[PDB]
């Protein structure tokens, strides 16, 4: 029905990448010459007009640090098609074989890029709701992009949101501070040892994560700004973008590598 439409025959589906309840995600081939990621709808497990609100949104929100919609087969079976990210989810990349070698300069660069994707989302006055590593894709050359896999994540969610349902670009910012610990511990779970009910209790009373081992203090301070009790006092993604981009000159000019960061 719109120019995003393509025929179900231009697609050679190849390797499975796992199932959610609504369908499957496949690596594959568009016009025999393009690496794509194809998302599935199992018919009857849900309606088109809901399964395709994703593609709908991915048509509005287009940006170099956001995941890229390519095309739709919006007639059953229904397919959504986007660019293929050759290193998968950022969470698997940080805990896997690749995380042995990632140092603070690549990690902050990743950070700078997700921030930049998020700067666009702020600008577009849209709200993410589930910023965290499991939702960032990594591509060739440590290229990161904000995605949503439709994965409660209270460990990543700002109080005002987990409690009262006040999700905003500012709760997205809290989540960013949590992402900064993921990047700086190679994707370890935030708040190790606490269980959800104690995170709510503990963060309510002002408890905040300490400096990760080897993380510079000024990055911890940035995490802390991200986690202010007061939504409006947390910084913009635009600020976050710039401060990160500029890190190794303005903020940590004497940075030296160590064993892990
Ligand atoms: C559920 C829903 C509903 C409404 C909107 C969304 N949004 N929202 C966004 C924002 C706001 C960030 C633009 C993005 C989405 N949707 C989305 O990210 N969908 C999506 C993206 C990539 C994939 N899968 C893979 N793709 C590209 N390489 C891979 C490489 C490895 C791998 N394992 C999976 C993949 C599946 C679904 C999501």
PDB file of C-alpha atoms and ligand atoms in Angstrom:
ATOM      1  CA  UNK A   1       0.000   0.000   0.000  1.00  0.00           C
ATOM      2  CA  UNK A   2       2.993   2.368   0.295  1.00  0.00           C
ATOM      3  CA  UNK A   3       6.411   2.594  -1.405  1.00  0.00           C
ATOM      4  CA  UNK A   4       8.058   0.698   1.489  1.00  0.00           C
ATOM      5  CA  UNK A   5       6.103  -2.298   0.146  1.00  0.00           C
ATOM      6  CA  UNK A   6       8.031  -5.153  -1.555  1.00  0.00           C
ATOM      7  CA  UNK A   7       7.155  -8.635  -2.852  1.00  0.00           C
ATOM      8  CA  UNK A   8       7.706 -11.670  -0.564  1.00  0.00           C
ATOM      9  CA  UNK A   9       9.841 -13.139  -3.396  1.00  0.00           C
ATOM     10  CA  UNK A  10      12.711 -10.592  -3.270  1.00  0.00           C
ATOM     11  CA  UNK A  11      13.761 -12.211   0.032  1.00  0.00           C
ATOM     12  CA  UNK A  12      15.994 -15.258   0.604  1.00  0.00           C
ATOM     13  CA  UNK A  13      15.637 -16.052   4.330  1.00  0.00           C
ATOM     14  CA  UNK A  14      18.663 -17.912   5.676  1.00  0.00           C
ATOM     15  CA  UNK A  15      19.754 -18.284   9.293  1.00  0.00           C
ATOM     16  CA  UNK A  16      17.380 -18.241  12.264  1.00  0.00           C
ATOM     17  CA  UNK A  17      18.200 -15.791  15.078  1.00  0.00           C
ATOM     18  CA  UNK A  18      15.652 -16.915  17.682  1.00  0.00           C
ATOM     19  CA  UNK A  19      11.962 -16.534  18.492  1.00  0.00           C
ATOM     20  CA  UNK A  20       9.854 -14.247  20.606  1.00  0.00           C
ATOM     21  CA  UNK A  21       6.220 -15.205  21.142  1.00  0.00           C
ATOM     22  CA  UNK A  22       4.956 -13.134  18.162  1.00  0.00           C
ATOM     23  CA  UNK A  23       7.337 -14.637  15.560  1.00  0.00           C
ATOM     24  CA  UNK A  24      10.913 -15.110  14.363  1.00  0.00           C
ATOM     25  CA  UNK A  25      13.929 -12.968  13.433  1.00  0.00           C
ATOM     26  CA  UNK A  26      16.056 -14.101  10.446  1.00  0.00           C
ATOM     27  CA  UNK A  27      19.311 -13.008   8.833  1.00  0.00           C
ATOM     28  CA  UNK A  28      19.092 -13.117   5.047  1.00  0.00           C
ATOM     29  CA  UNK A  29      19.035 -11.586   1.624  1.00  0.00           C
ATOM     30  CA  UNK A  30      17.111  -8.839  -0.169  1.00  0.00           C
ATOM     31  CA  UNK A  31      17.432  -8.570  -3.956  1.00  0.00           C
ATOM     32  CA  UNK A  32      20.041 -11.352  -3.720  1.00  0.00           C
ATOM     33  CA  UNK A  33      22.678  -8.715  -2.950  1.00  0.00           C
ATOM     34  CA  UNK A  34      21.784  -7.279   0.513  1.00  0.00           C
ATOM     35  CA  UNK A  35      22.304  -8.461   4.106  1.00  0.00           C
ATOM     36  CA  UNK A  36      19.027  -7.916   5.959  1.00  0.00           C
ATOM     37  CA  UNK A  37      17.372  -8.740   9.209  1.00  0.00           C
ATOM     38  CA  UNK A  38      13.822  -9.976   8.774  1.00  0.00           C
ATOM     39  CA  UNK A  39      11.282  -9.945  11.592  1.00  0.00           C
ATOM     40  CA  UNK A  40       8.268 -12.317  11.474  1.00  0.00           C
ATOM     41  CA  UNK A  41       4.627 -12.315  12.556  1.00  0.00           C
ATOM     42  CA  UNK A  42       3.233 -15.783  13.236  1.00  0.00           C
ATOM     43  CA  UNK A  43      -0.241 -15.416  11.740  1.00  0.00           C
ATOM     44  CA  UNK A  44      -3.064 -15.244  14.295  1.00  0.00           C
ATOM     45  CA  UNK A  45      -0.688 -14.614  17.218  1.00  0.00           C
ATOM     46  CA  UNK A  46      -1.544 -10.923  16.640  1.00  0.00           C
ATOM     47  CA  UNK A  47      -3.154  -8.472  14.220  1.00  0.00           C
ATOM     48  CA  UNK A  48      -1.285  -6.714  11.338  1.00  0.00           C
ATOM     49  CA  UNK A  49      -2.434  -3.218  12.508  1.00  0.00           C
ATOM     50  CA  UNK A  50      -0.412  -3.779  15.737  1.00  0.00           C
ATOM     51  CA  UNK A  51       2.506  -5.843  14.438  1.00  0.00           C
ATOM     52  CA  UNK A  52       3.096  -3.111  11.840  1.00  0.00           C
ATOM     53  CA  UNK A  53       2.992  -0.111  14.203  1.00  0.00           C
ATOM     54  CA  UNK A  54       6.656  -0.941  14.643  1.00  0.00           C
ATOM     55  CA  UNK A  55       7.443  -0.487  10.916  1.00  0.00           C
ATOM     56  CA  UNK A  56       5.169   2.575  11.057  1.00  0.00           C
ATOM     57  CA  UNK A  57       7.363   4.140  13.768  1.00  0.00           C
ATOM     58  CA  UNK A  58      10.592   3.043  12.109  1.00  0.00           C
ATOM     59  CA  UNK A  59       9.367   5.076   9.066  1.00  0.00           C
ATOM     60  CA  UNK A  60       9.077   8.241  11.175  1.00  0.00           C
ATOM     61  CA  UNK A  61      12.305   7.878  13.075  1.00  0.00           C
ATOM     62  CA  UNK A  62      15.246   7.683  10.707  1.00  0.00           C
ATOM     63  CA  UNK A  63      18.772   8.499  11.702  1.00  0.00           C
ATOM     64  CA  UNK A  64      22.320   7.224  11.304  1.00  0.00           C
ATOM     65  CA  UNK A  65      22.478   5.954  14.924  1.00  0.00           C
ATOM     66  CA  UNK A  66      18.978   4.411  14.797  1.00  0.00           C
ATOM     67  CA  UNK A  67      18.211   1.008  13.333  1.00  0.00           C
ATOM     68  CA  UNK A  68      17.204   1.207   9.710  1.00  0.00           C
ATOM     69  CA  UNK A  69      13.903   0.006   8.247  1.00  0.00           C
ATOM     70  CA  UNK A  70      14.237  -1.177   4.644  1.00  0.00           C
ATOM     71  CA  UNK A  71      10.877  -2.640   3.524  1.00  0.00           C
ATOM     72  CA  UNK A  72       7.567  -4.308   4.488  1.00  0.00           C
ATOM     73  CA  UNK A  73       5.606  -7.298   3.299  1.00  0.00           C
ATOM     74  CA  UNK A  74       2.406  -6.146   4.955  1.00  0.00           C
ATOM     75  CA  UNK A  75       0.287  -9.048   3.707  1.00  0.00           C
ATOM     76  CA  UNK A  76       0.292 -12.350   5.585  1.00  0.00           C
ATOM     77  CA  UNK A  77       2.678 -13.840   6.408  1.00  0.00           C
ATOM     78  CA  UNK A  78       3.912 -10.361   7.385  1.00  0.00           C
ATOM     79  CA  UNK A  79       7.576  -9.383   7.211  1.00  0.00           C
ATOM     80  CA  UNK A  80       9.551  -6.332   8.408  1.00  0.00           C
ATOM     81  CA  UNK A  81      12.998  -5.785   6.869  1.00  0.00           C
ATOM     82  CA  UNK A  82      15.917  -3.710   8.015  1.00  0.00           C
ATOM     83  CA  UNK A  83      19.661  -3.377   7.665  1.00  0.00           C
ATOM     84  CA  UNK A  84      21.656  -6.222   9.175  1.00  0.00           C
ATOM     85  CA  UNK A  85      24.021  -5.483  12.060  1.00  0.00           C
ATOM     86  CA  UNK A  86      26.901  -7.942  11.818  1.00  0.00           C
ATOM     87  CA  UNK A  87      27.884  -8.007  15.474  1.00  0.00           C
ATOM     88  CA  UNK A  88      24.463  -8.423  17.029  1.00  0.00           C
ATOM     89  CA  UNK A  89      23.107  -7.073  20.320  1.00  0.00           C
ATOM     90  CA  UNK A  90      25.511  -4.785  22.342  1.00  0.00           C
ATOM     91  CA  UNK A  91      24.984  -6.899  25.404  1.00  0.00           C
ATOM     92  CA  UNK A  92      26.305 -10.094  23.841  1.00  0.00           C
ATOM     93  CA  UNK A  93      29.219  -8.201  22.352  1.00  0.00           C
ATOM     94  CA  UNK A  94      30.343  -6.732  25.717  1.00  0.00           C
ATOM     95  CA  UNK A  95      30.110 -10.007  27.652  1.00  0.00           C
ATOM     96  CA  UNK A  96      31.406 -12.155  24.846  1.00  0.00           C
ATOM     97  CA  UNK A  97      34.869 -12.642  23.304  1.00  0.00           C
ATOM     98  CA  UNK A  98      34.979  -9.074  22.096  1.00  0.00           C
ATOM     99  CA  UNK A  99      34.749  -7.524  25.568  1.00  0.00           C
ATOM    100  CA  UNK A 100      38.198  -8.721  26.580  1.00  0.00           C
ATOM    101  CA  UNK A 101      39.681  -6.054  24.404  1.00  0.00           C
ATOM    102  CA  UNK A 102      37.335  -3.083  24.626  1.00  0.00           C
ATOM    103  CA  UNK A 103      38.919  -0.246  26.487  1.00  0.00           C
ATOM    104  CA  UNK A 104      37.478   3.035  27.766  1.00  0.00           C
ATOM    105  CA  UNK A 105      38.191   4.914  24.499  1.00  0.00           C
ATOM    106  CA  UNK A 106      36.074   2.547  22.365  1.00  0.00           C
ATOM    107  CA  UNK A 107      33.422   2.323  25.158  1.00  0.00           C
ATOM    108  CA  UNK A 108      32.931   6.045  25.380  1.00  0.00           C
ATOM    109  CA  UNK A 109      32.778   6.220  21.619  1.00  0.00           C
ATOM    110  CA  UNK A 110      29.991   3.679  21.735  1.00  0.00           C
ATOM    111  CA  UNK A 111      28.386   5.759  24.413  1.00  0.00           C
ATOM    112  CA  UNK A 112      28.793   8.958  22.248  1.00  0.00           C
ATOM    113  CA  UNK A 113      26.985   7.262  19.407  1.00  0.00           C
ATOM    114  CA  UNK A 114      24.035   5.952  21.338  1.00  0.00           C
ATOM    115  CA  UNK A 115      23.720   9.358  22.909  1.00  0.00           C
ATOM    116  CA  UNK A 116      23.663  10.801  19.400  1.00  0.00           C
ATOM    117  CA  UNK A 117      20.856   8.413  18.361  1.00  0.00           C
ATOM    118  CA  UNK A 118      19.129   9.474  21.539  1.00  0.00           C
ATOM    119  CA  UNK A 119      19.715  13.140  20.713  1.00  0.00           C
ATOM    120  CA  UNK A 120      17.598  12.622  17.610  1.00  0.00           C
ATOM    121  CA  UNK A 121      14.844  10.859  19.663  1.00  0.00           C
ATOM    122  CA  UNK A 122      14.821  13.885  22.086  1.00  0.00           C
ATOM    123  CA  UNK A 123      14.680  16.269  19.086  1.00  0.00           C
ATOM    124  CA  UNK A 124      11.835  14.264  17.558  1.00  0.00           C
ATOM    125  CA  UNK A 125      10.047  14.609  21.005  1.00  0.00           C
ATOM    126  CA  UNK A 126       9.716  10.851  21.121  1.00  0.00           C
ATOM    127  CA  UNK A 127      10.466   8.630  24.103  1.00  0.00           C
ATOM    128  CA  UNK A 128      12.259   5.322  24.150  1.00  0.00           C
ATOM    129  CA  UNK A 129      11.278   3.604  27.407  1.00  0.00           C
ATOM    130  CA  UNK A 130      13.791   0.796  27.172  1.00  0.00           C
ATOM    131  CA  UNK A 131      17.218   2.213  26.549  1.00  0.00           C
ATOM    132  CA  UNK A 132      19.691  -0.350  27.550  1.00  0.00           C
ATOM    133  CA  UNK A 133      22.514  -2.451  26.063  1.00  0.00           C
ATOM    134  CA  UNK A 134      20.238  -5.412  25.169  1.00  0.00           C
ATOM    135  CA  UNK A 135      18.544  -2.950  22.800  1.00  0.00           C
ATOM    136  CA  UNK A 136      21.658  -1.569  21.065  1.00  0.00           C
ATOM    137  CA  UNK A 137      22.924  -3.152  17.807  1.00  0.00           C
ATOM    138  CA  UNK A 138      26.661  -3.116  16.943  1.00  0.00           C
ATOM    139  CA  UNK A 139      27.735  -2.998  13.351  1.00  0.00           C
ATOM    140  CA  UNK A 140      30.856  -2.985  11.286  1.00  0.00           C
ATOM    141  CA  UNK A 141      33.540  -0.874  12.919  1.00  0.00           C
ATOM    142  CA  UNK A 142      32.006  -0.495  16.378  1.00  0.00           C
ATOM    143  CA  UNK A 143      29.060   1.359  14.880  1.00  0.00           C
ATOM    144  CA  UNK A 144      26.177   1.333  17.340  1.00  0.00           C
ATOM    145  CA  UNK A 145      22.482   1.938  16.758  1.00  0.00           C
ATOM    146  CA  UNK A 146      19.481   2.326  19.037  1.00  0.00           C
ATOM    147  CA  UNK A 147      16.869  -0.376  18.389  1.00  0.00           C
ATOM    148  CA  UNK A 148      13.864  -1.905  20.256  1.00  0.00           C
ATOM    149  CA  UNK A 149      13.452  -5.717  20.259  1.00  0.00           C
ATOM    150  CA  UNK A 150      10.183  -5.639  22.218  1.00  0.00           C
ATOM    151  CA  UNK A 151      11.859  -7.441  25.200  1.00  0.00           C
ATOM    152  CA  UNK A 152       9.715  -5.402  34.025  1.00  0.00           C
ATOM    153  CA  UNK A 153      13.205  -3.834  33.532  1.00  0.00           C
ATOM    154  CA  UNK A 154      13.167  -1.897  36.818  1.00  0.00           C
ATOM    155  CA  UNK A 155      16.938  -2.055  37.140  1.00  0.00           C
ATOM    156  CA  UNK A 156      17.109   0.202  34.033  1.00  0.00           C
ATOM    157  CA  UNK A 157      13.958   2.312  34.650  1.00  0.00           C
ATOM    158  CA  UNK A 158      13.845   5.627  36.502  1.00  0.00           C
ATOM    159  CA  UNK A 159      11.662   5.675  39.657  1.00  0.00           C
ATOM    160  CA  UNK A 160       9.110   8.169  38.446  1.00  0.00           C
ATOM    161  CA  UNK A 161       8.532   5.691  35.582  1.00  0.00           C
ATOM    162  CA  UNK A 162       8.555   2.322  37.299  1.00  0.00           C
ATOM    163  CA  UNK A 163       6.357   3.761  40.014  1.00  0.00           C
ATOM    164  CA  UNK A 164       3.906   6.216  38.461  1.00  0.00           C
ATOM    165  CA  UNK A 165       4.215   5.618  34.710  1.00  0.00           C
ATOM    166  CA  UNK A 166       5.816   8.977  33.981  1.00  0.00           C
ATOM    167  CA  UNK A 167       8.076   7.856  31.038  1.00  0.00           C
ATOM    168  CA  UNK A 168       9.845  10.839  29.425  1.00  0.00           C
ATOM    169  CA  UNK A 169      13.017  11.664  27.493  1.00  0.00           C
ATOM    170  CA  UNK A 170      14.292  12.250  31.046  1.00  0.00           C
ATOM    171  CA  UNK A 171      13.580   8.716  32.128  1.00  0.00           C
ATOM    172  CA  UNK A 172      15.349   7.569  28.949  1.00  0.00           C
ATOM    173  CA  UNK A 173      18.320   9.657  30.366  1.00  0.00           C
ATOM    174  CA  UNK A 174      18.343   7.740  33.660  1.00  0.00           C
ATOM    175  CA  UNK A 175      18.393   4.588  31.561  1.00  0.00           C
ATOM    176  CA  UNK A 176      21.468   6.005  29.815  1.00  0.00           C
ATOM    177  CA  UNK A 177      23.316   6.282  33.070  1.00  0.00           C
ATOM    178  CA  UNK A 178      22.519   2.546  33.619  1.00  0.00           C
ATOM    179  CA  UNK A 179      23.869   1.767  30.062  1.00  0.00           C
ATOM    180  CA  UNK A 180      27.080   3.573  31.117  1.00  0.00           C
ATOM    181  CA  UNK A 181      27.628   0.973  33.830  1.00  0.00           C
ATOM    182  CA  UNK A 182      26.946  -1.846  31.324  1.00  0.00           C
ATOM    183  CA  UNK A 183      29.624  -0.483  29.011  1.00  0.00           C
ATOM    184  CA  UNK A 184      32.031   0.000  31.891  1.00  0.00           C
ATOM    185  CA  UNK A 185      31.630  -3.533  33.445  1.00  0.00           C
ATOM    186  CA  UNK A 186      31.437  -5.364  30.152  1.00  0.00           C
ATOM    187  CA  UNK A 187      27.665  -5.801  30.390  1.00  0.00           C
ATOM    188  CA  UNK A 188      27.374  -7.055  33.946  1.00  0.00           C
ATOM    189  CA  UNK A 189      23.820  -6.715  35.490  1.00  0.00           C
ATOM    190  CA  UNK A 190      23.372  -3.340  37.214  1.00  0.00           C
ATOM    191  CA  UNK A 191      23.028  -3.452  41.005  1.00  0.00           C
ATOM    192  CA  UNK A 192      24.730  -6.863  41.375  1.00  0.00           C
ATOM    193  CA  UNK A 193      23.194  -8.832  44.285  1.00  0.00           C
ATOM    194  CA  UNK A 194      20.036  -6.740  44.608  1.00  0.00           C
ATOM    195  CA  UNK A 195      16.676  -8.109  43.522  1.00  0.00           C
ATOM    196  CA  UNK A 196      14.061  -5.803  42.011  1.00  0.00           C
ATOM    197  CA  UNK A 197      12.087  -4.950  45.190  1.00  0.00           C
ATOM    198  CA  UNK A 198      15.367  -3.834  46.738  1.00  0.00           C
ATOM    199  CA  UNK A 199      16.376  -1.576  43.839  1.00  0.00           C
ATOM    200  CA  UNK A 200      13.083   0.355  44.133  1.00  0.00           C
ATOM    201  CA  UNK A 201      13.566   0.560  47.932  1.00  0.00           C
ATOM    202  CA  UNK A 202      17.255   1.393  47.723  1.00  0.00           C
ATOM    203  CA  UNK A 203      17.107   3.960  44.868  1.00  0.00           C
ATOM    204  CA  UNK A 204      14.106   5.595  46.512  1.00  0.00           C
ATOM    205  CA  UNK A 205      16.343   6.375  49.501  1.00  0.00           C
ATOM    206  CA  UNK A 206      19.163   7.874  47.313  1.00  0.00           C
ATOM    207  CA  UNK A 207      21.350   4.779  46.915  1.00  0.00           C
ATOM    208  CA  UNK A 208      23.260   4.980  43.598  1.00  0.00           C
ATOM    209  CA  UNK A 209      25.857   2.716  41.938  1.00  0.00           C
ATOM    210  CA  UNK A 210      29.501   3.374  42.913  1.00  0.00           C
ATOM    211  CA  UNK A 211      32.304   4.096  40.504  1.00  0.00           C
ATOM    212  CA  UNK A 212      32.940   0.855  38.590  1.00  0.00           C
ATOM    213  CA  UNK A 213      36.502  -0.460  39.037  1.00  0.00           C
ATOM    214  CA  UNK A 214      38.798   1.579  36.822  1.00  0.00           C
ATOM    215  CA  UNK A 215      36.105   3.839  35.529  1.00  0.00           C
ATOM    216  CA  UNK A 216      37.225   7.490  35.759  1.00  0.00           C
ATOM    217  CA  UNK A 217      35.400   9.606  38.364  1.00  0.00           C
ATOM    218  CA  UNK A 218      34.102  12.158  35.882  1.00  0.00           C
ATOM    219  CA  UNK A 219      32.251   9.437  34.041  1.00  0.00           C
ATOM    220  CA  UNK A 220      30.802   8.299  37.287  1.00  0.00           C
ATOM    221  CA  UNK A 221      29.686  11.958  37.882  1.00  0.00           C
ATOM    222  CA  UNK A 222      27.976  11.900  34.534  1.00  0.00           C
ATOM    223  CA  UNK A 223      26.224   8.719  35.499  1.00  0.00           C
ATOM    224  CA  UNK A 224      25.212  10.466  38.682  1.00  0.00           C
ATOM    225  CA  UNK A 225      23.768  13.496  36.861  1.00  0.00           C
ATOM    226  CA  UNK A 226      21.784  10.993  34.833  1.00  0.00           C
ATOM    227  CA  UNK A 227      20.342   9.532  38.002  1.00  0.00           C
ATOM    228  CA  UNK A 228      19.074  12.650  39.757  1.00  0.00           C
ATOM    229  CA  UNK A 229      15.833  12.269  41.769  1.00  0.00           C
ATOM    230  CA  UNK A 230      14.486  15.147  39.804  1.00  0.00           C
ATOM    231  CA  UNK A 231      13.688  14.414  36.210  1.00  0.00           C
ATOM    232  CA  UNK A 232      14.241  18.025  35.013  1.00  0.00           C
ATOM    233  CA  UNK A 233      17.708  18.222  36.588  1.00  0.00           C
ATOM    234  CA  UNK A 234      19.053  15.329  34.469  1.00  0.00           C
ATOM    235  CA  UNK A 235      20.981  16.549  31.368  1.00  0.00           C
ATOM    236  CA  UNK A 236      19.956  16.395  27.751  1.00  0.00           C
ATOM    237  CA  UNK A 237      21.171  13.859  25.271  1.00  0.00           C
ATOM    238  CA  UNK A 238      22.547  16.729  23.288  1.00  0.00           C
ATOM    239  CA  UNK A 239      24.768  17.621  26.329  1.00  0.00           C
ATOM    240  CA  UNK A 240      25.573  13.874  26.789  1.00  0.00           C
ATOM    241  CA  UNK A 241      26.498  13.555  23.172  1.00  0.00           C
ATOM    242  CA  UNK A 242      28.884  16.469  23.217  1.00  0.00           C
ATOM    243  CA  UNK A 243      30.478  15.761  26.597  1.00  0.00           C
ATOM    244  CA  UNK A 244      31.228  12.156  25.446  1.00  0.00           C
ATOM    245  CA  UNK A 245      32.475  13.087  22.013  1.00  0.00           C
ATOM    246  CA  UNK A 246      34.814  15.544  23.675  1.00  0.00           C
ATOM    247  CA  UNK A 247      35.822  13.317  26.618  1.00  0.00           C
ATOM    248  CA  UNK A 248      39.483  12.557  25.997  1.00  0.00           C
ATOM    249  CA  UNK A 249      40.349  16.238  25.448  1.00  0.00           C
ATOM    250  CA  UNK A 250      38.123  18.392  27.760  1.00  0.00           C
ATOM    251  CA  UNK A 251      37.335  15.965  30.591  1.00  0.00           C
ATOM    252  CA  UNK A 252      40.077  13.289  30.747  1.00  0.00           C
ATOM    253  CA  UNK A 253      43.216  14.591  28.908  1.00  0.00           C
ATOM    254  CA  UNK A 254      45.565  12.482  31.118  1.00  0.00           C
ATOM    255  CA  UNK A 255      43.709   9.238  30.526  1.00  0.00           C
ATOM    256  CA  UNK A 256      46.070   6.206  30.476  1.00  0.00           C
ATOM    257  CA  UNK A 257      44.925   2.601  29.742  1.00  0.00           C
ATOM    258  CA  UNK A 258      44.817  -0.020  32.550  1.00  0.00           C
ATOM    259  CA  UNK A 259      43.987  -3.767  32.629  1.00  0.00           C
ATOM    260  CA  UNK A 260      40.220  -3.502  31.893  1.00  0.00           C
ATOM    261  CA  UNK A 261      39.461   0.065  30.986  1.00  0.00           C
TER     262      UNK A 261
HETATM  263  C1  LIG B   1       8.403  -3.681  19.287  1.00  0.00           C
HETATM  264  C2  LIG B   1       8.411  -2.204  18.750  1.00  0.00           C
HETATM  265  C3  LIG B   1       7.223  -1.492  18.571  1.00  0.00           C
HETATM  266  C4  LIG B   1       7.248  -0.194  18.103  1.00  0.00           C
HETATM  267  C5  LIG B   1       8.481   0.403  17.815  1.00  0.00           C
HETATM  268  C6  LIG B   1       9.676  -0.282  17.967  1.00  0.00           C
HETATM  269  N1  LIG B   1      10.860   0.306  17.703  1.00  0.00           N
HETATM  270  N2  LIG B   1      11.143   1.444  18.112  1.00  0.00           N
HETATM  271  C7  LIG B   1      12.387   1.707  17.708  1.00  0.00           C
HETATM  272  C8  LIG B   1      13.109   3.053  17.971  1.00  0.00           C
HETATM  273  C9  LIG B   1      12.165   3.930  18.822  1.00  0.00           C
HETATM  274  C10 LIG B   1      14.464   2.874  18.699  1.00  0.00           C
HETATM  275  C11 LIG B   1      13.406   3.701  16.591  1.00  0.00           C
HETATM  276  C12 LIG B   1      12.887   0.655  17.017  1.00  0.00           C
HETATM  277  C13 LIG B   1      11.911  -0.246  17.048  1.00  0.00           C
HETATM  278  N3  LIG B   1      11.942  -1.458  16.498  1.00  0.00           N
HETATM  279  C14 LIG B   1      13.014  -2.254  16.382  1.00  0.00           C
HETATM  280  O1  LIG B   1      14.121  -1.919  16.796  1.00  0.00           O
HETATM  281  N4  LIG B   1      12.817  -3.458  15.791  1.00  0.00           N
HETATM  282  C15 LIG B   1      13.761  -4.413  15.562  1.00  0.00           C
HETATM  283  C16 LIG B   1      15.081  -4.083  15.186  1.00  0.00           C
HETATM  284  C17 LIG B   1      16.031  -5.087  14.954  1.00  0.00           C
HETATM  285  C18 LIG B   1      15.716  -6.453  15.074  1.00  0.00           C
HETATM  286  N5  LIG B   1      16.624  -7.439  14.854  1.00  0.00           N
HETATM  287  C19 LIG B   1      17.856  -7.264  14.275  1.00  0.00           C
HETATM  288  N6  LIG B   1      18.066  -6.280  13.348  1.00  0.00           N
HETATM  289  C20 LIG B   1      19.248  -6.054  12.761  1.00  0.00           C
HETATM  290  N7  LIG B   1      20.306  -6.819  13.031  1.00  0.00           N
HETATM  291  C21 LIG B   1      20.200  -7.839  13.920  1.00  0.00           C
HETATM  292  C22 LIG B   1      21.337  -8.604  14.189  1.00  0.00           C
HETATM  293  C23 LIG B   1      21.241  -9.621  15.127  1.00  0.00           C
HETATM  294  C24 LIG B   1      20.027  -9.869  15.781  1.00  0.00           C
HETATM  295  N8  LIG B   1      19.968 -10.867  16.660  1.00  0.00           N
HETATM  296  C25 LIG B   1      18.882  -9.110  15.522  1.00  0.00           C
HETATM  297  C26 LIG B   1      18.966  -8.080  14.587  1.00  0.00           C
HETATM  298  C27 LIG B   1      14.407  -6.769  15.428  1.00  0.00           C
HETATM  299  C28 LIG B   1      13.433  -5.774  15.662  1.00  0.00           C
HETATM  300  C29 LIG B   1       9.624  -1.586  18.455  1.00  0.00           C
END
